[PDB]
Amino acid sequence: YNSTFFSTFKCYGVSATKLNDLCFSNVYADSFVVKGDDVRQIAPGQTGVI
């Protein structure tokens, strides 16, 4: 909350307000870089080049 801010942050399968009350089993992080018009394509059930 002091330094880093996100333009989009959307989660599926769990509400955000409960993220501090849980514990997570098999955590993986995928990283890449896209353009601005492709950020909407990183979602379930989407079409496009990405």
Added chain:
Amino acid sequence: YNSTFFSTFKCYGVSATKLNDLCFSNVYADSFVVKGDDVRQIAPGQTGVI
């Protein structure tokens, strides 16, 4: 996918991932130009000047 890119693309009545497996009956295309704050108004169940 080579030349033209869309900032918003949202469809209603059919999932996007099935658009290559179907055939369409009565296809019409409406064209116009708006400002940036009015693109959100082109949707079902919306209010505003547009």
